[PDB]
Ligand binder design. Structure first.
Ligand SMILES: CCCCCCCCCCCCC(=O)O
Ligand SMILES: CCCCCCCCCCCCC(=O)O
Lengths: 121, 121
C-alpha cells in the first residue's frame, strides 16, 4: 500500500513521497502518457509497468510487511500479492535514490498536459 | 487557512472554491472516498494526503501569508506549520490550473456509490 511505499521512499531518498514524488514528470505520482522526462521519471514508469502486471492484486491498498537488513530492504513473506507488490515498490524506491543527483525541481508539478502518447511499457 | 487557499484557487483558476471545487469527484470536498476520477480529482486527493503529513498543525484555520514573485506563488516565512500548510495549498492550486483543460461538469455532485476502491495515505 502507498503507506509502505511512501515510507520506503523517505528511507531511501530522504524526501517525503508527497511534494517530492506525487507529481514529478509524466509518470511520477500516477499518470501514464508521454515519454519519461528523466531517470527519476523512468522509474515511476517502470514502477507503473510493475503494478500493471499484478491483475490479481490490489497494489495501491494491500498492506505488506518489510524489514531493512544491514541497510537493505527485504520483503517479508506474505501472500503472493504482498510479495510481488513489495518488490515493485522496493525497486522503484532504490532507483529513486540511485538517481537523486539528477532530481530536478524543474520537473515537480510538471504539466501532465505536455505528455502525449502511450509507450509500449 | 482555507481563506488563503480559496484565494489562490480563485487566482490560479478563476473559479470559486465553493461549487467548482467543493463537490467535484470523489475527493474535492470533504467526503473523501474511492479512487480519484480525473486529473482535478487527483490534485484534491494529493492535497488532503498532504494535510495528513501535518498532524501537529491545523490547516483549516491557521493563517499564513504568501505573495507572488515574477508571477509565481511563494510562501512567505513563518512558523513551520504555516509554511508546510502553504506548500500543500500552493501545489494544489497550481495543479487545478494545469488541469483546467480536462475539468468537466459531469463530475460535480458526483454520487457516493460511484466512488469505488479502498485508498489510504
Ligand atoms: C498523483 C499521486 C499521489 C499519491 C502518490 C504518492 C507517491 C508517488 C510516487 C510513486 C510513483 C507512482 C507509480 O509508479 O506510478
Ligand atoms: C469560502 C471558504 C473555503 C473554500 C475552500 C474550499 C477548499 C476546496 C478544496 C478541495 C478539497 C481538497 C482536498 O480534499 O484536500
Amino acid at each position: 500500500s502507498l503507506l509502505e511505499f511512501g515510507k520506503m521512499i523517505l528511507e531511501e531518498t530522504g524526501k517525503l513521497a508527497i511534494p517530492s514524488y506525487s507529481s514529478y514528470g509524466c509518470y511520477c505520482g500516477w499518470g501514464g502518457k508521454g515519454t519519461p522526462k528523466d531517470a527519476t521519471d523512468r522509474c515511476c514508469f517502470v514502477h507503473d509497468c510493475c503494478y500493471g502486471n499484478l491483475p490479481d492484486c490490489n497494489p495501491k491498498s494491500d498492506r505488506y510487511k518489510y524489514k531493512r537488513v544491514n541497510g537493505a530492504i527485504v520483503c517479508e513473506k506474505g501472500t503472493s500479492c504482498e510479495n510481488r507488490i513489495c518488490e515493485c515498490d522496493k525497486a522503484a524506491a532504490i532507483c529513486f535514490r540511485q538517481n537523486l543527483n539528477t532530481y530536478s525541481k524543474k520537473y515537480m508539478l510538471y504539466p501532465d498536459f505536455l505528455c502525449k502518447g502511450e509507450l509500449k511499457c
